[PDB]
Design a protein around this ligand. Structure first.
Ligand SMILES: *[C@H](CC(=O)N1CC(C)(C)C1)C(=O)NNC(=O)CCc1ccccc1C(=O)N[C@H](C)c1cc(-c2cnn(C)c2)cc(-c2ccn(CC)n2)c1
Ligand SMILES: [Cl-]
Ligand SMILES: [Cl-]
Ligand SMILES: [Cl-]
Ligand SMILES: [Cl-]
Ligand SMILES: [Cl-]
Ligand SMILES: [Zn+2]
Ligand SMILES: [Zn+2]
Ligand SMILES: [Zn+2]
Ligand SMILES: [Zn+2]
Ligand SMILES: [Zn+2]
Length: 313
């Protein structure tokens, strides 16, 4: 007894296969998945006639197709993606304040905050898998996007997470080649040194939440023994992410794009998303609250940008 099915790694290039109904899928295809569900140790049923299956890349054609779609050669990626997708497809993705959020489940507070942020900054992903899922996420079908985010970050469903580390991984898979940042550090003793950063390092900074303060100057130890001052010289990027350890901060409407609120201890806390629309909105998964002012524990703030040059001589 034999049925005919499709195997794929990208759900674009399908490959017809013949499968013996007396052997498990793993004995003929290796690890095999159906809509994220592991069917490796399952004998083929009759309802599987014509359906499409994801398989781990076992030959060169599937390896090339897998990279062109996911931009990774890690053999385990597809499995971690499918294993995460089996859960994220059960989450609810309500529209909250014109954005796609996530109803709370499996400790996804940080994923919801990252998803809401990604929808408010200008970003193009290099892997076609990410870009396709990015689009479907804006339309409300964010399951594949969240599953891919977990896979690219080497995190699993249930694990707690950091929003800044998550954003950092995603930027590494985004087209930020045009982004440039020139910095200058003035040291009374040693002197002046001007560096330029490209890529992800041009849009992320750890230290202060204020973009204005970064323009004026921040205090940084010099390699000589004096506390030097660093300031921003040029910034060519569509946005900037300013992160700092959680501290009480005042967000003023219209001066920022969005922000991450963190309440709790290191590696054990709750995330909330603050966005600046006509007023200030706070999105906590499926819950929404509005207020004209906001003071609270903020760890990330996102600002819009295009081209900046300093007036400090
Ligand atoms: C969400 C949990 C969830 O879904 N819920 C709802 C519930 C209440 C029922 C539980 C979730 O996933 N939360 N994430 C975490 O709990 C883990 C956070 C984490 C993970 C890995 C690395 C770092 C962090 C983390 O704690 N990040 C925050 C932003 C943080 C906090 C501090 C901090 C807090 N208090 N102190 C004294 C320090 C510090 C830092 C930080 C980053 C870098 N540095 C030094 C340069 N400090 C980050
Ligand atoms: Cl790549
Ligand atoms: Cl669940
Ligand atoms: Cl990439
Ligand atoms: Cl207004
Ligand atoms: Cl802004
Ligand atoms: Zn790539
Ligand atoms: Zn589940
Ligand atoms: Zn010095
Ligand atoms: Zn206002
Ligand atoms: Zn929550």
């Amino acid at each position: 007894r034999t049925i005919k099915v499709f195997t794929t790694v990208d759900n674009i290039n399908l490959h017809t296969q013949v499968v013996d109904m007396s052997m498990t899928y793993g004995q003929q295809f290796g690890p095999t998945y159906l809509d994220g569900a592991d069917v490796t140790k399952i004998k083929p049923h009759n309802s599987h006639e014509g359906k499409t299956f994801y398989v781990l890349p076992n030959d060169d054609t599937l390896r090339v197709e897998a990279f062109e779609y996911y931009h990774t050669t890690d053999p385990s990626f597809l499995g971690r993606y499918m294993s995460a997708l089996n859960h994220t497809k059960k989450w609810k993705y309500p529209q909250v304040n014109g954005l796609t959020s996530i109803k709370w489940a499996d400790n996804n507070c940080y994923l919801a905050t990252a998803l809401l942020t990604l929808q408010q900054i200008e970003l193009k992903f290099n892997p076609p898998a990410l870009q396709d899922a990015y689009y479907r996420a804006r339309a409300g079908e964010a399951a594949n996007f969240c599953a891919l985010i977990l896979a690219y970050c080497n995190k699993t469903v249930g694990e707690l997470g950091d929003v800044r580390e998550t954003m950092s991984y995603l930027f590494q898979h985004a087209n930020l080649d045009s982004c440039k940042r020139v910095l200058n550090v003035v040291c009374k003793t040693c002197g002046q040194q001007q560096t330029t950063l490209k890529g992800v390092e041009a849009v992320m900074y750890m230290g202060t939440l204020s973009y204005e303060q970064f323009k004026k100057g921040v205090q940084i130890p010099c390699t000589c023994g004096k506390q030097a001052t660093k300031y921003l010289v040029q910034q060519e990027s569509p946005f900037v992410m300013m992160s700092a350890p959680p501290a009480q901060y005042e967000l003023k409407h219209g001066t920022f794009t969005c922000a991450s609120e963190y309440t709790g201890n290191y590696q054990c806390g709750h995330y909330k998303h603050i966005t600046s629309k006509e007023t200030l909105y706070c999105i906590d998964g499926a819950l929404l609250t509005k207020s004209s002012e906001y003071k609270g524990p903020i760890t990330d703030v996102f600002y819009k940008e295009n081209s900046y040059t300093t007036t400090i001589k």
